[PDB]
Amino acid sequence: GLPVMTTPGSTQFLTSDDFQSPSAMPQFDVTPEMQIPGRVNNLMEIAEVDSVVPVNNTEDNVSSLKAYQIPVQSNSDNGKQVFGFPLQPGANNVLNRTLLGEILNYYTHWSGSIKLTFMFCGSAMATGKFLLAYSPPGAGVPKNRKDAMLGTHVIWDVGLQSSCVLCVPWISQTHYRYVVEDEYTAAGYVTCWYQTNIVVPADVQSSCDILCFVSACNDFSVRMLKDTPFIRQDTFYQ
Amino acid sequence: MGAQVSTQKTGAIHYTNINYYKDAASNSANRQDFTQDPGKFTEPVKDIMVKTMPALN
Amino acid sequence: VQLQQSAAELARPGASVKMSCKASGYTFTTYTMHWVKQRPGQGLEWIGYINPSSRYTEYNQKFKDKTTLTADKSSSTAYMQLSSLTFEDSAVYYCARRSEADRFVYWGQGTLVTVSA
Amino acid sequence: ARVADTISSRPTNSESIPALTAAETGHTSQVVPSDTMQTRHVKNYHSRSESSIENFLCRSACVYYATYTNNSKKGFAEWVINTRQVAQLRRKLELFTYLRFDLELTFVITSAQQPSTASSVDAPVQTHQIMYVPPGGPVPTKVKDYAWQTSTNPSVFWTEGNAPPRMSIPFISIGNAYSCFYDGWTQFSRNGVYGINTLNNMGTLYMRHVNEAGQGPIKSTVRIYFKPKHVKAWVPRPPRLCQYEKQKNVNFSPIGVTTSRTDIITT
Amino acid sequence: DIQMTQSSLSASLGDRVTISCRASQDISNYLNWYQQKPDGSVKLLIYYTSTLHSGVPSRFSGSGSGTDYSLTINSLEQEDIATYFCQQGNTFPFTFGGGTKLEIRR
Amino acid sequence: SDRVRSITLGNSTITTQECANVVVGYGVWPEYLKDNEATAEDQPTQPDVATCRFYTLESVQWMKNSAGWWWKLPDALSQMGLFGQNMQYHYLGRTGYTIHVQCNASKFHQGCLLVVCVPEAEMGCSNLNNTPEFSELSGGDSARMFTDTQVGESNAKKVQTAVWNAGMGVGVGNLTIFPHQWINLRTNNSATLVMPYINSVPMDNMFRHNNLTLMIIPFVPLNYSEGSSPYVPITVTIAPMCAEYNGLRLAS
Ligand SMILES: CCCCCCCCCCCCCCCC(=O)O
C-alpha cells in the first residue's frame, strides 16, 4: 500500500486530454497500409490552394455562376472603379466561404500574407491596364484613383500572360488578428481601378470578365481552434 | 524501464512517459508530428516552372 | 427564434389578399418556408414552399394557379398571395420552417382569412 | 513547424516578372511579398502546430444520445454505430475522402426520477451495462435476456457517481482506410441502395439498467463521445455548403454561394 | 398522395391514452406527431416513430411499424387536452392526418 | 516552346500547338500494382497495347446559355473496344487515366471553362428521400448536363443539377482543390490531366463503382459578335494507363 494523495481534477472528463486507456479488442490485427495518392499532413496545405472568390454578390447573382464574374467594359471617362471590399477573410461575406475563409472559421487567430490572383477572361484582341491597390486602415476607403495610388499598388498590363498577382503584406501592430469582426484589428481595403481603357477592334465584344482567386503565402498561420458558425442542427439526421 | 524522455511545447524542458498496455492502439495521441509537403497540391505539374521566368514560352 | 404572421383579413369573393410571415432569430436565407392551410371542419393541408436564396417556389398540384409565394432577403419577410377568392378559401393559414427532412419545428400563429359580402 | 521568414528587398528594374503568371496551368503561384515591393528582414517564430491533422481531429465530440426506462419491460436502448447523425463531426470528417484512425470512446450516463405514486422512495446507486454486438451475433430482445451473458462480446459495467467509462478501439476495417464517400451500389445490377450506406457495417450498441425496478421508475440517458487518435488522411474535399438533410445519403436543397451585399464597390 | 387515416377520444385525468393513425402504403418509419393547443399554436412532439423532440415531457411515447402507428400518453394532465395530427414525410407532397381531440370523460 | 506537346499511347497520337502545362495527379504517375500491396492471388492480365490507347467520346456543343457537363469515368469506356470487353469478363480491375479535353475558337471569341477531375463524386437526388437512378447518373459516352435552375422535388428519382452547388452540395468555386485546369480561349486551346489509381482498396469492380468524375463547367460564358462562327464543340479523349484485371469468369 503505497501512500498517495489525489489532487483536484480527479474523475473529470475534459474533452481535450491526452491519456492512455485499455483496449476493448486485445491483439487485434489491423489491415496493412497502402500508398494512396494525396496525403495531407497539415491544414495549411489546403488554404494555400487558390479558389475563386465571389466578388459579385448583388442579391440576384448569389444563386448562379454570375457571382464570380467581375464585369469590365470599354468606358468614355477614365479612372473608374471596378470593385472594392474590406480585407476580412473570415467575417466579410466576399471571402467568407472560399477555401481559405472556410478553414479560418474553425480558428480564432490568423497572421500572414494573402495572395490575390486575377485572370482576364476576355478576347485575345482586347487590351487594358488596371490598378490593383491595397490601403492600410486609419483613413477611410479610397474614393479616387488618386487616393488609391498612395497605398500598396501594382499596375497590370494584359497580354500573353493573362494573370497578375497582388500580394498584400502583413502590416499590423499585433502579431495576430481576430477572425471575427474586430475594429481593433482591422486590416484595410482592396480596390481596383482603370489605369487606361479597354480598347477592342471592330466585331469584338467590348464587355469582358475577370476572375479572382485567393490563397495564402508560406508565412500564414492560425491559432485557437473553435467550432464553425456555418453548420447547424435541430433534430437528429435520420 | 522504457521511459521515453521527450521535449515540451514552449515559446520563443522535458517530460517523461511510459507505455502501460500491450496494444499500440492504446497509447496517447501523437500531437508533435510536424510534416509539410504542400507542393503536391500547389505544384501538381509535370514540367517545373521557375517563378521569375514567364509561364508560357 | 419565432415567426410572426400578420393580422386577420377579410375580402370580397373574387378579390385578392396577401399574408405575411416575418421571421427573426435566425438566418432567413438558409431554410425554406412552407405554408399550411387548415379549414375549420378539416385537417391540415400543405400548399407549397419557397427557397428564399433563389426565389424558387414549388406548389401543390391543387393550389398551383391560385397561390403565389414571394419573399425578400432584405426585410426577412415571406409573402403569400391568394387570387380568385371563393368560399372554399376561408381557413387559417400557417407559415412553418422545414428542418432536417420533413419536420416543421417552428410554426407561426396563423391568420384568419374570411370571405363575405 | 516554423513558418518561412521574409528577406530584405531592393529596387529592381529587370526583365524578370514574378507578378505575371498564367493561372490556366492549374498551378498556384509561389510569390512572396519581397518580390513585388521593398521589404525588411523579419524572422518569424510562428509555428504551424495547431493546424495539424492530429490537432484538428483529436477532440471529443458527441455522436448520439439515447434513453431507456427502468419500470418497463423491454426498456433498453440500441444504436447502429455511425458518424452521420450530428452536424459538427460529420463536417470535420468529410473534408477528406479517406481516413484511418484509432478511437477513444467515452460515455456520459445520467438519470432522472419519474413520477411514481409510492410513498418514500429511496434507491441505491444504479449500475448500467453497455454491450457491443459485432455484425452477425445474437441481439437482445428484452432486459432479462440470455444475450447479456457477454461470453465473447465486450461490455462495460459502471456504477453511478464515479468517473465516466472509457475504452480504446483499433482501426477495425476491411479496407485500407475508412471511406466518407462512396460512388456506387451494393448490387452488381446497379439497383437498390446507392452511396455510403453500402460500406457501413460496424455493429450495434445496447444499453440497460442492471438493477431491478424497486419502487419508482428511473429514466436514464447515455451520451456517446468519439475521439480519433493516430490519424491519417488522404484526398482533401471542399467543405459542405448546404445543410445536411438525411443520414444515409448526401441529398440537399440548393442554396446560394454566399450572402449578398448591395454593390460591387461597397465596403 | 398517401392517405393518412386517423376522431375524438375521451379519457379521464391520470390515465393511459392511445391515439393511432394508419397510412395507405408503407412509409418506412417516417412519421411525425404534432399538437395544436386550443388557442391555435402548433408544436412538434415526436419527430420519428419514437424520438421525442427537446422540451417534450416523458409522458409521450411513439411506436408502430410499417403502416400502423400509435401515440401514447401514460398519464393524462390538463395540458395534454389538445388536438393531435400525424404527418408522413415519405412521398411528395406532405399529407397530414385528421385531428383527434381529447376530452374529459364525465 | 512550352506550348507544344505530343502524347503517344499505343497506335494513337495527340498533337497540340497551344496549350498549358500537363497536370499530373497528386504528384504521382500511374504504375502497376506491387507485390507487398496486392491481395488477389491469381495472375493478372496486362494486355497494355489493346486497352491503353486514346478513345474519343462524343462531342457536345458549347452554347451561350450552357451550364456544364459531366462523365463518370470507368463507365464511358464500357463499350469502347477491348477495354470494355475486358471489363465484362473479369471481376476486378485497376486503371489510371490521361484525359485530353480540346476546344478551339478564334481570337474573336471569348470564354473560360474549368476542367476538373473529382474522385468519389456522390450526386444528390431531387427528391430528398430517394437516391438517383443509374440512367440519370451516367450515360455510355454521352454527357449528362447541369442546369442553371433547380430541379423540382416532384421528380422522384433525378439528379439535382443546380450548377452552383456542383451536384454535391458544395461551392462550385472551391472545386480547384482537385486536379484541375482551365481552358481560356484567349490563351489556351486544350487541357491535359494525368490521374493515378485512387481508392481505399487495391482493386475494385468496375461496374458497381465509378471512382472518377470529369466535370466541365463554363465560368465565363461564350460570346462572339455577329459574323463569327456560332457552332463551337467540345471533345474529350481518354486513354487508360497501366490497366490490369483479375477474376476471369462468364461475360455478365
Ligand atoms: C466498450 C464497448 C464498446 C465498443 C464499441 C466499438 C465501436 C466501434 C466504432 C467503429 C468506428 C466507425 C468509424 C466510422 C467511419 C468514418 O470515418 O466515416
Distance separating alpha carbons of residues D164 and D107, to the nearest angstrom: 6
Domain count, chain E: 1
Cβ of A121 within 8 Å of Cβ of F111? The answer is yes
Q: Give the closest of E30, E32, E96 to C43, CB-based.
A: E96
For the CA of D202, the closest atom of ligand 1 is 10
Question: Using a 6 Å cutoff on CB, does residue D80 contact ligand 1?
Answer: no
B20 touches chain D (CB under 8 A): no
Of D131, D178, D247, best ligand 1 pocket probe by most atoms within 8 Å of the beta carbon? D178
Phi, psi of A220 (to 5 degrees): -75, 145
Domain total of chain B: 1
Q: Report d(CA A69, CA F149) in Å as an integer.
A: 18
Q: How far is the CA of B25 from the centre of ligand 1 (A)?
A: 13
DSSP code per residue over chain D? -BPP-PPP-----SS--SSEE-GGGS------TTTTS---------B--TTBHHHHH-S-EEEEEEEEESSSTT--EEEE--S-SSSHHHHHHTTEEEEEEEEEEEEEEEEEE----SSS------EEEEEEE-TTS---SSSS-GGGG-SSS-EEEEETTSPPPEEEE----SSSSEES---BBSSTTS-S-BSGGGG----EEEEEE-S---SS-EEEEEEEEE--EEEEEEEE-PPP-SPP--SSS-------SS---S-SS--
Tell me, yes or no, if B41 comes closer than 8 A to chain F by beta carbon: yes
| CA gyration radius, chain A | 24
Are A and D neighbours with ≥3 CB pairs closer than 8 A? yes
F142-157 residues labelled b (16+ CB within 10 A) or e (exposed): ebbebebebbebebee
Residues A210 and A118: beta-carbon distance below 8 Å: yes
Identify the experimental approach: cryo-EM
Contact (CB, 8 A) for C38 and C45: yes
In a domain? residue E3: no
Ligand 1 atom closest to Cα of residue D165: 1
Query: Is D37 within 8 Å of chain A by CB?
Result: yes
For B56, the domain range is: 1-57
Nearest to E90 among F129, F153, F154 (CB): F129
Rounded CA separation D134/D203 (Å): 5
Residues of chain A with a CB closer than 8 angstroms to some CB in chain C: 59, 62-63, 232-238
Set of cell numbers at residue D267: 465596403
**Residue B24: helix, strand or coil by DSSP?**
helix
F residues 37-56 closer than 8 Å to A (CB): 37
Residue of chain F nearest A160, judged by CA positions: F187
Among protein residues, the one whose CA lies closest to atom 4 of ligand 1:
D132
Q: Is the CB of D167 under 6 A from ligand 1?
A: yes
- Would you tell me which residues 21-40 of chain B have a C-beta closer than 8 angstroms to some C-beta of chain F? 39-40
User: Rounded distance, CA E35 to CA E100, Å?
Assistant: 10
Of A21, A23, A45, the CB nearest to B41: A45
Q: Is the CB of D99 under 6 A from ligand 1?
A: yes
CB pairs under 8 A between C and F: 9
d(CA B38, CA D48) in angstroms, rounded, equals: 13
Residue D169, ligand 1, Cβ within 6 A:
yes
CA distance B27 to B30: 9
Other Cβ atoms closer than 10 A to D198: 18
Q: Which of D79, D169, D176 to mutate to test the pocket of ligand 1 (most atoms within 8 A of CB)?
A: D169
Among E29, E58, E75, which would you mutate to test the D interface (most chain D Cβ atoms within 10 Å of its Cβ)?
Answer: E58
CATH of the domain at E54: 2.60.40.10
Residue C100's CATH number:
2.60.40.10
According to DSSP, the β-strands at C9-11 and C111-115 are parallel
Q: Which of B33, B36, B42 to mutate: most D Cβ within 10 Å?
A: B33
D132 Cβ below 6 A of ligand 1 = yes
Domain holding C19, by residue range, is: 2-115
Structurally, chain C folds into a number of domains equal to: 1
User: Residue F85 maps to which CATH number?
Assistant: 2.60.120.20
**Domain carrying residue F35:** 5-248
What gap in Å lies between CA F180 and CA F22, rounded to an integer? 10
